[PDB]
Amino acid sequence: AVSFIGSTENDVGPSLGSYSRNLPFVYTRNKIGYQNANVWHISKGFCVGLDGKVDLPVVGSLDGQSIYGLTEEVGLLIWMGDTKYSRGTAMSGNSWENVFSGWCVGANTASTQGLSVRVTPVILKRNARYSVQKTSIGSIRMRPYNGSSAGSVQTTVNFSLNPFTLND
Numbered sequence: 001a002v003s004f005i006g007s008t009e010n011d012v013g014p015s016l017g018s019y020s021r022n023l024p025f026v027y028t029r030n031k032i033g034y035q036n037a038n039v040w041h042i043s044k045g046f047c048v049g050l051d052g053k054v055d056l057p058v059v060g061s062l063d064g065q066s067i068y069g070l071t072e073e074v075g076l077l078i079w080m081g082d083t084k085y086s087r088g089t090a091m092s093g094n095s096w097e098n099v100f101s102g103w104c105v106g107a108n109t110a111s112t113q114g115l116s117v118r119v120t121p122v123i124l125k126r127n128a129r130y131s132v133q134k135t136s137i138g139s140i141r142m143r144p145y146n147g148s149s150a151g152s153v154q155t156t157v158n159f160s161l162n163p164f165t166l167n168d
């Protein structure tokens with residue numbers, strides 16, 4: 001079985017957090033993130049992975065991963081994936097991408113399926129502080145497999161970047 005147990009709208013990073021440092025310049029480990037181990041409850045052999053999608057415009061790339069634009073001065077490198085931050089998948093493009101290959105809970109037990117979103121800021125144009133306002137980032141959808149069914153359960157949750165300030 002499967003049930004939606006998380007929230008539809010999720011904020012990434014602490015509200016009004018401040019982070020200190022040729023263009024572009026990359027700043028923050030897992031500070032600017034959202035993590036929740038319990039977004040769906042799954043049981044009895046339900047098999048499930050995750051897809052992710054970023055809606056922000058791509059304004060460049062670094063090492064195979066897109067730089068997503070927020071404003072003229074600030075961009076973002078983004079990762080989406082399973083609960084643990086180290087399992088994040090670097091995002092590229094604006095399409096749904098596989099960000100967690102998946103797992104199956106045992107035939108006779110129960111657990112939960114989680115997710116995480118992480119971003120690190122990139123300075124694109126220098127001006128001595130850069131502030132960004134609350135911005136929609138994208139979404140993550142569960143991906144049942146092995147015959148498992150999404151059914152009527154809510155499949156998608158969204159993410160918004162909480163406002164932040166970058167210090168020279």
Ligand SMILES: C[Se][C@@H]1O[C@H](CO)[C@@H](O)[C@H](O)[C@H]1NC(C)=O
Nearest residue numbers: 037038082083103111112113114
């Ligand atoms: C460690 Se069990 C279970 O594993 C799945 C797949 O890795 C993860 O998405 C869930 O967040 C986790 N639930 C917990 C920790 O409560």
